[PDB]
Amino acid sequence: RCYVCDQQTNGVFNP
């Protein structure tokens, strides 16, 4: 998960 609020990223990671 993320760093800011531990949101489910689901791998999705974008420019």
Partner 1 sequence: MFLYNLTLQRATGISFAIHGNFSGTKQQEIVVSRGKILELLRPDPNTGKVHTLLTVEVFGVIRSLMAFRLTGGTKDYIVVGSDSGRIVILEYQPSKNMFEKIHQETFGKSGCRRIVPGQFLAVDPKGRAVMISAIEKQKLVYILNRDAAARLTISSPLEAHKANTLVYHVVGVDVGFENPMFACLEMDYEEADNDPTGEAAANTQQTLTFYELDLGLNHVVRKYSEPLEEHGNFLITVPGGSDGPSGVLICSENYITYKNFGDQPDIRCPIPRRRNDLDDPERGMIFVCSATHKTKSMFFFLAQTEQGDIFKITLETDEDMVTEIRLKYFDTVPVAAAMCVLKTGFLFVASEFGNHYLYQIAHLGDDDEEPEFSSAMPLEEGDTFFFQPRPLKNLVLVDELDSLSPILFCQIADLANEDTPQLYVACGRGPRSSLRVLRHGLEVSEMAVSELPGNPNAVWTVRRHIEDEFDAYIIVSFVNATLVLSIGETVEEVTDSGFLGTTPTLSCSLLGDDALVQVYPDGIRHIRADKRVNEWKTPGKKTIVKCAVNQRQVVIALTGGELVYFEMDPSGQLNEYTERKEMSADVVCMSLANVPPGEQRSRFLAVGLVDNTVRIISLDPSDCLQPLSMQALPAQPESLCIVEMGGTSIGFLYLNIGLQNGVLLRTVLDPVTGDLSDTRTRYLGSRPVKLFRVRMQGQEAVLAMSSRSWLSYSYQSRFHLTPLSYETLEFASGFASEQCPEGIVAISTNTLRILALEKLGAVFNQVAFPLQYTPRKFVIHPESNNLIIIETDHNAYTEATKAQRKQQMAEEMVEAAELAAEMAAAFLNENLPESIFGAPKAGNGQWASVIRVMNPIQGNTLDLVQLEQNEAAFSVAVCRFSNTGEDWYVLVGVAKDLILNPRSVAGGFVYTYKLVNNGEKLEFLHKTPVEEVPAAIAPFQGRVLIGVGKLLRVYDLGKKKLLRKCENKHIANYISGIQTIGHRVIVSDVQESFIWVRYKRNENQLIIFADDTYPRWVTTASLLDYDTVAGADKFGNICVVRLPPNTNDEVDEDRGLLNGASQKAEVIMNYHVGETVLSLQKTTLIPGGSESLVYTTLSGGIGILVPFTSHEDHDFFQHVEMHLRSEHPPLCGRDHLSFRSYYFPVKNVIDGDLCEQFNSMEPNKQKNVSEELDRTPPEVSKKLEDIRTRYAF
Q: Does 5 bind partner 1 (CB under 8 A)?
A: no
d(CA 11, CA 9): 5
Q: Does 15 bind partner 1 (CB under 8 A)?
A: yes
Q: Which two tokens stand for residue 11?
A: 């791998």
Q: Which of 4, 5, 6, 10 binds partner 1 (CB under 8 A)?
A: 10
Q: Does 7 bind partner 1 (CB under 8 A)?
A: no
Do residues 11 and 1 make contact, with C-beta atoms less than 8 angstroms apart?
no
Q: Does 4 bind partner 1 (CB under 8 A)?
A: no
Of 4 and 15, the one with the shorter C-beta distance to partner 1 is: 15
d(CA 11, CA 2): 10
